[PDB]
């Protein structure tokens, strides 16, 4: 049985190898069990300095979500997160606008909808629009990593053509696709 909560299933992975791109982080995820798990209920993380993977920086980065960490990871030079679950969206057009250091990829119903395939100091990208064909819980996953230094990850979403954006949080997230009452 998988726990039902108003959030995405979160996994954190650390490494002492360099993360340069999405492929490197996905390979890290493939290579071992998560260094920690957590509930991603308020996906607006950071900003901080001096490496996400060292000391208590992950806790600080995750903020309101850190109280759900399964363990306190040891130090690494590089690290990142893999989030997966469901997000309630009505049929219509949407676009992400993401602030991040380093890179990331977000997919909805298996299709990439926001990609930065490289390292970067903090930068905000307004991504191209996509459509949702049927109202309901949509499958969503995210990866984000830090190669070192500063770190931030805030992927906001607009349903109104970029006039207003919201953080993905417990209002609309579901870990399993069932309706959370938590
Ligand atoms: O990863 C970013 C780009 O490289 C360095 O400037 C650190 C910074 O956080
Ligand atoms: Ca794994
Ligand atoms: Ca630690
Ligand atoms: Ca909390
Ligand atoms: Ca590094
Ligand atoms: Ca960084």
Author numbering: 10 to 191
Quote the study on this structure.
MpPA14 (Marinomonas primoryensis PA14 domain) lectin is a domain of a 1.5-MDa adhesin responsible for a symbiotic bacterium-diatom interaction in Antarctica. PA14 domains share a β-sandwich fold and the presence of two consecutive aspartate residues in a cis peptide linkage (DcisD).
Crystal structures showed that MpPA14 selects the pyranose form of pentoses for binding. For instance, despite l-arabinose existing in solution predominantly in the pyranose form at 25°C (57% α-arabinopyranose versus 30.5% β-arabinopyranose), only the α-anomer complexes MpPA14 via its 1,2-diol.
